[PDB]
Design a protein around this nucleic acid. Structure first.
Ligand code: MG
Ligand code: MG
Ligand code: MG
Ligand code: MG
Ligand code: MG
Ligand code: MG
Ligand code: MG
Ligand code: MG
Ligand code: MG
Lengths: 68, 113, 215, 132, 177, 50, 202
RNA sequence: CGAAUCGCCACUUCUCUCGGCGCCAAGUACCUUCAUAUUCACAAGA
RNA sequence: GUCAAAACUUAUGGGCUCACGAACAAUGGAUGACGCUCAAGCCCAAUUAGUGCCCAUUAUUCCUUUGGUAAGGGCGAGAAAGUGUAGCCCUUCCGAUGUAGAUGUGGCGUGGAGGUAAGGACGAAGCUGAUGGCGUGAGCCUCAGAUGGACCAGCCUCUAGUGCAGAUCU
RNA sequence: CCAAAACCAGCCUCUACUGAGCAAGAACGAGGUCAUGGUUUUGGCGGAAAUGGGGUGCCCCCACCCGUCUUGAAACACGGACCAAG
């Protein structure tokens, strides 16, 4: 769940990659299991909840870890 | 990693300035809190007991042990990785100079050095 | 000295458990081939075969513990069905068939397959030991519980609680009543009888399916 | 040696990079590292600009397409290796071998072009319905 | 869907006694979801007819019966049923289906709708396959003609589930969901 | 569940199967069917998915 | 700049199914723009539905109708109310989603010539009604219920259609070019590609 | 002012009852830049 | 169907239905609302289809706590013969709601006393506190006062005029 | 400190009979997972970072004023403005 704060904060390569210092922030999870008989899945985002502001909003579900 | 990090506050302490936040068990048949309706405040119980080998352990990893004078430091000489002296609030800054340069020489930890 | 005598025993017990379950495997394969010949004999003879009646039901408490009457409430305690999806094997005496008939809305039951018996005893099986509820894990665990030259294997247990046993009580009583999980894929209606399209009551051999999702 | 690296990921297979700097890049899997270690996919950089470098098997999609690159000597890819002349020299020695290994195959002209390809989850696109 | 009701033939008898040393065996065709209900309906008729009861008898055979084939045919199902609104309506409706089991289950859904009649109120009384002509009923008679052609008019063609879509461009089948 | 096709062999109800492996063979209603874009489109999407 | 809007074309859709599907997508963040809400259908004769609406209109606060339930008569305002009744209209999550919906009578010139128009197959009238059962086109009932612009919209709908149709044969020479240009593209140098196009049906 | 967003188009963007393209060479020829950004990590790019 | 998790409105199921339909006369307005009508209704059956899913303080399992007058083992720092503490240590098992009420508590806390130990003008008590820390909790402790100005916490024993949102309490 | 991958364990999920069916049994293979256990590895961050707490706002969600006598209190039943000392 990628979003942004209003100030920059430490990111994964804050020092190695200055180019990457947004006030953009991201909250990671895993798809955990399918939810319902439709395409929905359950994502736990780490130990924490994802914020309720995230709702209705672009989650980005990555193709990894790959299986296939 | 604590069960509950919040205080178990008294019911409706927030409305009444006089009430201390400190817990009192609710009573009265109609108490929403002792009837334990789901939207209400929780009550303390045995189930919130902290894990028992991490209990009493401050984030430093030490169990605090009160200290008043330089002699107390030797009560912690041999268990200096388990206990950390917390110097009492009322020892003088005078005496604390003495506790502190000695709590340094002995390798005992101090919470407020 | 004793340290190794514990080996002479632990080695001798699987030698026994091997010998036991080799017999039980044969006593199953043989007993059923013999029970196929007869029903197959009879079809050739234009003739029916009255299959021997079940001598063991896997009763399962299926409603919860609230609002239950003093008579049903006692029968469930004597069945040791004190929670929801508890399970016990009770052999089908008339006196039991009259207990089961008294609390059927509270239970699902039927006639366990040998496989159903294996899964419960191996997976969900727990001995009572010093009142402790002890997960089965060793045959050592079983021979200590059952001081009985007959009952040594976990295969001894599965035969007793399936063949109907001479120690069917000696065995099933030393087992804590089984604590099954709710049937995966759900029940149907814990309120109606099975033939009503519900859940409770005798459901014959079908219990193995229902009880399989649980184990 | 030990390797649980999955059957779908074999040396000389083409393999989409799902993550990291080289997203969507088809990349031949040159070799798996000496222990159950990360793959060393290579571009070849002559094509898609992917350097010899390590990638975890979880972060690529091993396409069914491959190349019979048993002929190529990727032995110079060892963990101890992991832009300096010794390394710039290494891939040059390798990509030229790896690149010709691609040439030997019938339909080896597409695989050169197939490796110039960049994967992208375009809208309406359903990888889970995809096979590879 | 495959038929609602399997075709069982439950055979059984009152258990032998010095009272009745060589008891009659009773065959009994049933259409049940499963044998445990077929065995049940079988003991329903044993006490409602033979005064023998489930405690005192013993089913000798629960086995399901094999389908006659698969060709489309024609079934005269004879179905007694009950209600407060009607206490015992004998009623030979005919149904067109591939199997006795299918005609019968088809007769339960038919019977459950036109009559708020549950399975256990109903009892089948027989399910003959019928030849074309014997079917007095006019509805299925329409389907007898070897030359019958009809349109599949005003279809709702839902997509294969894998392909279904919430939003689509209007004169296209580009997805937009 | 079925979508009638423009093709249709002449035939009699309850006809036996070996009669059919016959008659459609004498027309190749099937081999003729795959020829159509309506058929190819189905095998086409069935090649892309495959 | 325009946001990722999707302009659902609501003609001949069931009112409440389209309102239900749309009301869900608004929650999933879609920024829908319903059009031709005049053309939404409802089950039953118009008289069934006028009486349903006039029983709606019959409801007002006696104490002060001014603040009472408001009986919008625009088919679009009727579709917005129908779609706000299907979303959490008091939480901000839903108050937000409702503002992400823009109903229009007809298809307005800002929304025309903006992109293709989507459709909701689950809310299609043919998908839903039994075809021979009577149905209420929505802008038709609401003309009888007070909407005053039912003929203003038809005059507009006539204009966009006659206009869109004029542009459809203004471009017939153009579309015909790409059809011809593309067919002769197969004959071009795409040889091996011509076989990879035959497979897959291109 | 750092942001979240991640297909476009006058081949859809009419009506009434497989739209085109884009996805790494402006093209099917792989000429040809990519590394050390050192195996995920907001795409560090639009 | 939306609200609402789930049939992104599933069925490659049957019937029935046009106007209503979905366990226990008067403020306008209630299948809960919308809306639904080849249903989003009713009867029936189903579960991917003649080749399911969602939600409990429930169940099961895992972690932790507490209780057991439960079962055992043991006796770099620790290893106490132990009801109870910061539990001597470890292991396993079962229990846990609760008004009136009963009981427990090396349970909390207050004024005083016998002791012990200690602190204080390098700042006692008191008070203030996005001072954190500890304890299930009553609470304790520390930090900081740009607060104060001189007393006083710990521990065991003794004691009581000992703990307050509510008495139309003073 | 944040991550990610792996390994092992655990765990979980995913023939027989019958006349095509079942009341029917395993196997192979693969996946998932540390809010499971043990094995590190590899990167990211490092006057600051980091975890925790605290504060304020929001979001989604849950949530009937307490005490009281009473079968029954959110009651259109009583007592209840605030605080301090008692
Ligand atoms: Mg149910
Ligand atoms: Mg009841
Ligand atoms: Mg970015
Ligand atoms: Mg939903
Ligand atoms: Mg209690
Ligand atoms: Mg006093
Ligand atoms: Mg404050
Ligand atoms: Mg007093
Ligand atoms: Mg009264």
């Amino acid at each position: 769940y990628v979003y942004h704060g209003y100030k920059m904060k430490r990111c994964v390569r804050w020092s190695k990659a200055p180019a990457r210092r947004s006030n953009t922030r991201a909250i990671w999870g895993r798809v955990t299991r399918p939810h319902g008989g439709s395409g929905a899945v359950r994502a736990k985002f780490n130990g924490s909840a994802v914020p309720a502001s995230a709702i209705g909003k672009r989650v980005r579900v990555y193709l990894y870890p790959s299986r296939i | 990693v604590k069960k509950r990090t919040k205080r178990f506050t008294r019911h409706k302490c927030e409305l009444f300035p006089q009430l201390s936040s400190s817990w009192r068990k609710p009573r009265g048949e109609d108490s929403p809190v002792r009837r334990r309706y789901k939207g209400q405040k929780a009550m303390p119980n045995k189930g919130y007991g902290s894990d028992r080998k991490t209990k009493y352990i401050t984030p430093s990893g030490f169990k605090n042990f009160p200290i008043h004078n330089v002699q107390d430091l030797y009560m912690l000489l041999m268990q200096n990785r388990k206990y950390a002296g917390v110097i009492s609030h009322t020892v003088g800054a005078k005496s604390r100079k003495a506790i502190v340069r000695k709590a340094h020489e002995l390798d005992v930890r101090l919470i407020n050095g | 000295k004793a340290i190794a005598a514990n080996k002479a025993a632990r080695v001798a017990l699987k030698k026994a458990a091997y010998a036991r379950g080799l017999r039980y495997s044969r006593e199953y394969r043989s007993a059923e081939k013999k029970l196929v010949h007869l029903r197959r004999q009879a079809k050739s003879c234009g003739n029916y075969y009255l299959e021997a009646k079940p001598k063991v039901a896997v009763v399962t408490r299926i409603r919860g513990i609230a609002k239950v009457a003093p008579k049903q409430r006692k029968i469930l305690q004597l069945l040791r069905l004190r929670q929801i999806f508890n399970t016990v094997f009770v052999r089908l005496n008339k006196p039991m068939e009259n207990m089961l008939r008294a609390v059927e809305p509270y239970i699902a039951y039927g006639y366990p397959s040998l496989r159903t018996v294996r899964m419960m005893v191996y997976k969900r099986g727990h001995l009572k030991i010093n009142g402790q509820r002890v997960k089965i894990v060793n045959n050592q665990m079983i021979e200590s519980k059952y001081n009985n030259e007959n009952i040594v294997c976990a295969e001894d247990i599965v035969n007793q609680i399936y063949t109907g046993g001479k120690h069917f009580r000696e065995v099933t009583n030393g087992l804590w009543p089984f604590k099954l999980s709710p049937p995966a894929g759900g029940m149907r209606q814990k309120r109606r009888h099975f033939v009503e399209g519900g859940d409770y009551g005798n459901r014959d051999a079908l219990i193995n399916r229902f009880l399989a999702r649980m184990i | 040696e030990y390797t649980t690296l999955r059957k779908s990921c074999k040396p000389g297979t083409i393999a989409i990079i799902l993550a990291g700097r080289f997203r969507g890049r088809r990349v031949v899997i040159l070799k798996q590292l000496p222990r159950n270690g990360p793959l060393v996919i290579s571009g070849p950089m002559k094509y898609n600009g992917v350097p010899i470098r390590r990638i975890d098997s979880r972060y690529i999609i091993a396409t069914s397409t491959k190349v019979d690159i048993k002929n190529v000597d990727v032995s110079g890819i060892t963990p101890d290796i992991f832009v300096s002349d010794a390394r710039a020299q290494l891939q040059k020695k390798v990509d030229a071998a790896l690149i010709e290994a691609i040439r030997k195959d019938p339909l080896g002209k597409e695989k050169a072009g197939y490796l110039h390809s960049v994967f992208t989850i375009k809208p309406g696109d359903a990888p889970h319905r995809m096979r590879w | 869907v495959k038929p609602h009701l399997r075709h069982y033939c439950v055979v059984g008898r009152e258990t032998p006694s010095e009272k009745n040393p060589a008891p009659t065996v009773y065959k009994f065709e049933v259409f049940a979801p499963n044998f445990v209900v077929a065995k049940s309906r079988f003991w329903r008729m044993m006490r409602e007819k033979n005064k023998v009861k489930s405690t005192h008898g013993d089913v000798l055979s629960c086995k399901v019966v094999k389908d006659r084939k698969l060709a489309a045919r024609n079934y005269s199902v004879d179905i007694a049923y009950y209600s407060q609104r009607c206490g015992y309506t004998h009623m030979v409706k005919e149904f067109r289906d591939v199997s006795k089991a299918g005609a019968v289950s088809q007769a339960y859904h038919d019977l459950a709708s036109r009559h708020r009649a549950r399975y256990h109120n109903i009892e089948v009384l027989g399910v003959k396959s019928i030849p074309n002509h014997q079917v007095k009923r006019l509805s299925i008679s329409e389907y007898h003609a070897s030359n019958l052609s009809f349109p599949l008019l005003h279809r709702r063609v839902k997509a294969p589930r894998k392909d279904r879509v919430v939003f689509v461009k209007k004169n296209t089948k580009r997805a937009v969901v | 569940n079925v979508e009638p096709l423009k093709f249709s062999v002449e035939l009699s109800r309850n006809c036996s199967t070996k009669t059919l492996k016959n008659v459609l063979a004498e027309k190749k209603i099937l081999e003729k069917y795959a020829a159509t874009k309506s058929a190819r489109r189905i095998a086409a999407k069935r090649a892309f998915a495959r | 700049h325009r946001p990722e809007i999707i302009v659902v074309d609501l003609k001949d859709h069931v009112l409440g199914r389209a309102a239900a599907i749309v009301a869900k997508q608004l929650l999933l963040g879609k920024k829908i723009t319903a059009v031709r809400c005049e053309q939404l259908t409802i089950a039953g004769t118009e008289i069934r539905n006028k009486i349903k609406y006039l029983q709606f209109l019959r409801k007002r606060k006696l104490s002060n109708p001014k603040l009472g339930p408001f009986h919008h008569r625009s088919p679009s305002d009727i579709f917005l109310r129908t779609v706000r009744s299907m979303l959490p209209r008091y939480t901000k999550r839903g108050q937000k989603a409702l503002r992400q919906l823009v109903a229009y009578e007809g298809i307005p010139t800002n929304v025309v010539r903006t992109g293709g128009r989507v459709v909701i197959p689950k809310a299609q009238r043919h998908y839903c009604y039994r075809s021979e059962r009577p149905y209420t086109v929505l802008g038709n009932m609401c003309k009888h219920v007070g909407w005053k612009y039912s003929d203003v919209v038809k005059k507009l709908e006539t204009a966009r259609v006659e206009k869109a149709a004029r542009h459809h044969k203004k471009t017939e020479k153009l579309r015909a070019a790409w059809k011809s240009a593309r067919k002769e593209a197969l004959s071009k140098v795409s040889k091996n590609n011509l076989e990879v196009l035959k497979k897959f049906g291109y």
